[PDB]
Amino acid sequence: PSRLRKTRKLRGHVSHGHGRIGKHRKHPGGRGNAGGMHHHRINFDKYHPGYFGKVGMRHYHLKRNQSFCPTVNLDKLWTLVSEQTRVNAAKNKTGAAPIIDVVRSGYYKVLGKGKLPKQPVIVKAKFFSRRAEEKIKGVGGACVLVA
C-alpha cells in the first residue's frame, strides 16, 4: 500500500526527507560491512563484540544428524502420555508405575528441570542427566537405558 507510505507525504518538499546540507548520495560509508576495522569500528565493537578473529577447532565434514539428541525435562514428562495413564496410577493399588518411552515421543535425552509429581514411573531413554535420574528415583521409579 503505497497509499499509506511516506513518499506520498513528502511530495512537494525539496529534499525528500534527506536534508539539504548533506544529501542522499550513493554510498557514503562504503558498501555493506565495509570498514569493520576502520571507520565503522565503533559500531562493530559496541554491538558485535567478537566479530573479528578465529576461535576453536575446525571440523571438516560436519554432519548434523550424528549429534542429534533432542532433550526433554522432567517438568513435562507426563505430557508425553495420555492423562489416563497418570490417572490409572494414583489409583490401581498394585504399585504398578506406567512406562514412559521418551524415545518414542522424539526425545533422546532426559534432563532434570522441574518437580516430578509423587507418582512412580519407568522412563525409557537413550540418555539421562544425573539430576533427572535422581529426581526419578526420589519419586519411586526406575530409569531405563535404551539403544
Partner: protein, 210 residues
C-alpha cells in the same frame, strides 16, 4: 554503513541474480498437468494399482531417523529367494526389486518376506488369454474386482508396541543409569591404551624370565 545495532548481515545479491530469477507462475498449471498425466497412467495400467509396484519396508540410516521406517527402493534378492519368487518374474507381478541391498539383520528380512507373502495372497493375477491356465485366478476373483488400488499398495505405518505397567523390581530401582553411561563412555575412551599398557606389562613379565 551500519547504524546502532542489528545483524551484520551478508546478502548474496552481488552476482547478476535477476538474470536467473525463477518464478513459480507455472505451479498451478504444473500441478494439473501432473495430475492429468497421473490419471492417464492409471487408466493405461487398467486393474493394476495406480501406486506402482509394491515396495519393501526399510529403516532409515543415522541415529536421527533410525527409529522411523519408510518404503525402500525394492525388495532384496534374499527376500525374494526366501519368499520363493523368481527375481525376473517378480518385476512382472508388480514387486519392486533392487539387487544392491545387502541384508544385515534377520529381523528386517523376515518382515520383508512376510510382506511379499501377504502380497501374493491378496494379488489377483489375470490369465494371459481369456482361456484360463494355471496360476491365473478364478473368474469370481476377477469379476468381483478388476479394481485399481488407490494410494500406496499395502502402506507402511510406523507403529509402536504398548508396554504395560510393571512393578519396578528392586534391581531396576538399584540401577545407576547416569553413572553407567559415564563408565561406558570412559571404557570406550580408555579401552585402547589400557590394552597397550597390559601388552607392555606382559612384555615386562616375559623380559623378566630371559
Amino acid at each position: 554503513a551500519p547504524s546502532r545495532n542489528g545483524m551484520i548481515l551478508k546478502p548474496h545479491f552481488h552476482k547478476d541474480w535477476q538474470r536467473r530469477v525463477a518464478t513459480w507462475f507455472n505451479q498451478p498449471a504444473r500441478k494439473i498437468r501432473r495430475r492429468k498425466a497421473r490419471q492417464a497412467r492409471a487408466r493405461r495400467i487398467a486393474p493394476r494399482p495406480a501406486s506402482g509396484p509394491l515396495r519393501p519396508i526399510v529403516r532409515c540410516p543415522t541415529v536421527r531417523y533410525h527409529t522411523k521406517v519408510r518404503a525402500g527402493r525394492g525388495f532384496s534378492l534374499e527376500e525374494l529367494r526366501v519368499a520363493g519368487i523368481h527375481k525376473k518374474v517378480a518385476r512382472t507381478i508388480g514387486i519392486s526389486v533392487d539387487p544392491r541391498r545387502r541384508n544385515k539383520s534377520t529381523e528386517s528380512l523376515q518382515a520383508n518376506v512376510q510382506r511379499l507373502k501377504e502380497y501374493r495372497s491378496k494379488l489377483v493375477l489375470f490369465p494371459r488369454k481369456p482361456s484360463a491356465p494355471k496360476k491365473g485366478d478364478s473368474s469370481a476373483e476377477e469379476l468381483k474386482l478388476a479394481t485399481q488400488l488407490t494410494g500406496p499398495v499395502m502402506p507402511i505405518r510406523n507403529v509402536f508396541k504398548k508396554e504395560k505397567a510393571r512393578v519396578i523390581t528392586e534391581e531396576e530401582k538399584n540401577f545407576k543409569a547416569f553413572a553407567s553411561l559415564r563408565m561406558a563412555r570412559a571404557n570406550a575412551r580408555l579401552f585402547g591404551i589400557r590394552a597397550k599398557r597390559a601388552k607392555e606389562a606382559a612384555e615386562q613379565d616375559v623380559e623378566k624370565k630371559k
